[PDB]
């Protein structure tokens, strides 16, 4: 796995590393905390991956709804699908029925998720045809 695997150079926008600088030849890295009490993983602060859609190292912002679900698919590149289970109330029978919804979420390289984990996703701007949520926290399952 290498950062420069695309036909274009991968870098954080407007983050300039001056070559005519001191000996601290460390590529300047930008990151942010997303707020709402979510901790920035050190793999984002200290990492080298480039992800414009990452909540911590990218330009997306987390605002709106916060959801939790179970990972059911990691077969896409940097995108997962979580399954949300809920009970729907049927008033006539005074009972419930099990239902589920599949939500596609973006996962940054700062997280490692496998099928079966419970993740917390925050809403972001539409970053794909079906993706509006972005992984913020991972709980091993």
């Amino acid at each position: 796995l290498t950062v420069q695997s695309e036909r274009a150079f991968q870098k954080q926008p407007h983050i300039f590393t001056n070559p005519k600088a001191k000996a601290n030849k460390k590529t300047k890295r930008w990151y942010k905390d997303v707020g709402l009490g979510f901790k920035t993983p050190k793999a984002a602060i200290e990492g080298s991956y480039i992800d414009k859609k990452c909540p911590f190292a990218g330009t997306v912002s987390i605002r709106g709804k916060i959801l939790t679900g179970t990972v059911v698919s990691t077969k896409m590149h940097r995108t997962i699908i979580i399954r949300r289970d809920y009970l729907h109330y049927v008033p006539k029978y005074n009972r419930y029925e099990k239902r589920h919804k599949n939500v596609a979420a973006h996962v940054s390289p700062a997280f490692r998720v496998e099928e079966g984990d419970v993740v917390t996703v925050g809403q972001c701007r539409p970053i794909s045809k079906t993706v509006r949520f972005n992984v913020l926290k991972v709980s091993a399952g």
Binding site: L36, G37, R63, I66
Partner: protein, 260 residues
Amino acid sequence: ARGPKKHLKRLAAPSHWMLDKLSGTYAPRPSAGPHKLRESLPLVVFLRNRLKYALNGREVKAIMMQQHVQVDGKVRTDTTYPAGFMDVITLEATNEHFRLVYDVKGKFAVHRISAEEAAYKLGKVKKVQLGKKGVPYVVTHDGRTIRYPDPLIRANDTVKIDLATGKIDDFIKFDTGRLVMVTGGRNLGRVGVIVHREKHEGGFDLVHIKDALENTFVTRLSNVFVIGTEAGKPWVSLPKGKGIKLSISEERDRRRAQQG
């Protein structure tokens, strides 16, 4: 659909205008202005339905075209001008000054004020930020922009507008113990003091308010308007009832005693 709406059906008008169903098909659509459509009172409704100075919409336009009506110290000739909370309406021909403050029943009271009090108004600070050339400014609830504010002023504070020069006389910081009127929701018009502000990052902050009768209610921070520095010390005259909500049984008892 293809552009802005220009009509307002009578049934779809705000309920606090207290318009009757059968007087016609339409209601006055408030113009664009300092106050939102749903939270305003067009001058046609105020001059005809409330004061009953004008008998119909033709007459209210005749009144305003003679330069009689002033809102916030400026002559307005727009019959659907959206007057709102804390606005001052002056009719110097009748030597009357009104302030639009909510009564406890949720409507805009016909609240007459003295000429000395009609010389200022209160505005809730919505945002503080820097304009061009790095000049800070304050946006109040009625869309006013005041430049060079006191650097201590922050959002949710209340400023006292001189209303003749448009400047800020002084302000009240939002904090526990401040006098408050509620300007939205089902507790609209109630007056009490802040007891506890409950924060919710990413959501809506809630304010706990205690009535003068030690009744406690909760409302969103966006519906909270600081009107005084402490209990019993409002910066404007309160309408009759002092923003104290009585139960329907209490109102029935009060009406029986008042009429004998």
